[PDB]
């Protein structure tokens, strides 16, 4: 599945993401590679508002 | 016909990520018995409301909008459990959540299609 493969190595270098969220995001693309952009997408949007002020 | 024991819940700060499990056995219950497994949350004055399903011979899934990306459903049929991944949470996803489910394949997103119901576990998200 490469919008699997992607999204991991996409979440794995997003730099606002602490370790927990990381491993959680990685581990819903395990759980539901059907929702691989969707997953990416939320994972985009918790980078985004965790963007330090 | 089959029980279900969900477990995991606790609390979280906003941000957090949990991830809930759900225990299913029956006395003929195999790993492509036509069964559809869901969560539900009741959240602080509100009924149970339908947050993912996953069918289990398939393991075809479904989620409620609301909760789309930020969590997943997903079922291991050789230990006979559904989990669902929770991340990116919020304090609005404060809530009992049940694990549920149906022998055949539901008719609605409510409550009234799922006849074998765990016993509940409190998620808290603090901000």
């Given at each position: 599945n490469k919008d699997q493969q992607s999204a991991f190595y996409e979440i794995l270098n997003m730099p606002n993401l602490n370790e927990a969220q990381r491993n959680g995001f990685i581990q819903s693309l395990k759980d539901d590679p059907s929702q691989s952009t969707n997953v990416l997408g939320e994972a985009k949007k918790l980078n985004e508002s965790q963007a330090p002020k | 016909?089959?029980?279900?024991?969900?477990?995991?819940?606790?609390?979280?700060?906003?941000?957090?990520?949990?991830?809930?499990?759900?225990?299913?056995?029956?006395?003929?219950?195999?790993?492509?018995?036509?069964?559809?497994?869901?969560?539900?949350?009741?959240?602080?004055?509100?009924?149970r409301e339908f947050v993912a399903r996953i069918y289990w011979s398939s393991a075809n899934t479904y989620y409620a909008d609301s909760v789309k990306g930020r969590f997943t459903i997903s079922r291991d049929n050789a230990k006979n459990t559904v989990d669902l991944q929770m991340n990116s949470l919020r304090p609005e996803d404060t809530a009992v959540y049940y694990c549920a489910a149906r022998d055949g394949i539901p008719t609605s997103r409510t409550v009234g299609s799922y006849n074998y119901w765990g016993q509940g576990t409190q998620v808290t998200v603090s901000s």
């Open positions: - | 016909q089959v029980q279900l024991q969900d477990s995991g819940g606790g609390l979280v700060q906003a941000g957090g990520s949990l991830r809930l499990s759900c225990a299913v056995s029956g006395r003929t219950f195999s790993a492509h018995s036509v069964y559809t497994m869901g969560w539900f949350r009741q959240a602080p004055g509100k009924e």
